[PDB]
Amino acid sequence: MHTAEFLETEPTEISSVLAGGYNHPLLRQWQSERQLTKNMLIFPLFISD
Amino acid sequence: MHTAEFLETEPTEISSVLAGGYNHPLLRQWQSERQLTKNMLIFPLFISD
C-alpha cells in the first residue's frame, strides 16, 4: 500500500540554517530594524469652527 | 576705531538650511534612526562556584 517516502538527504548546509535567529519571543524583537515607540505617533485632530 | 564688519551676502540657498529638522526636543528624537529601548539591553553576570 501507500507509505511515506523519504528521500536520501545530504548533510545540512550551514547556509541553509536561518532558524537560530528567530526561535524565541525576544529574538523576533531583536530581528526588527526599528521598534514602535510612543513618540513615533502622530495623531490627527479635525478642528471645527 | 575697530567696528564690526559685516560682509555683503547673497540670498539664502535652500540647500544650506538644515535647522528646520532639529529645532525642538521631539525632533532630536525624530532624527535618530533607532531609539534605545529596554529590550535592547543585555546584562553580564559573573557566576561563582
Curated annotation (Swiss-Prot), chains A, B:
Coiled coil: none annotated. Present with 11600 molecules/cell in log phase SD medium. This is Delta-aminolevulinic acid dehydratase. Homooctamer. It comes from the Eukaryota. Catalyzes an early step in the biosynthesis of tetrapyrroles. Binds two molecules of 5-aminolevulinate per subunit, each at a distinct site, and catalyzes their condensation to form porphobilinogen. Belongs to the ALAD family.
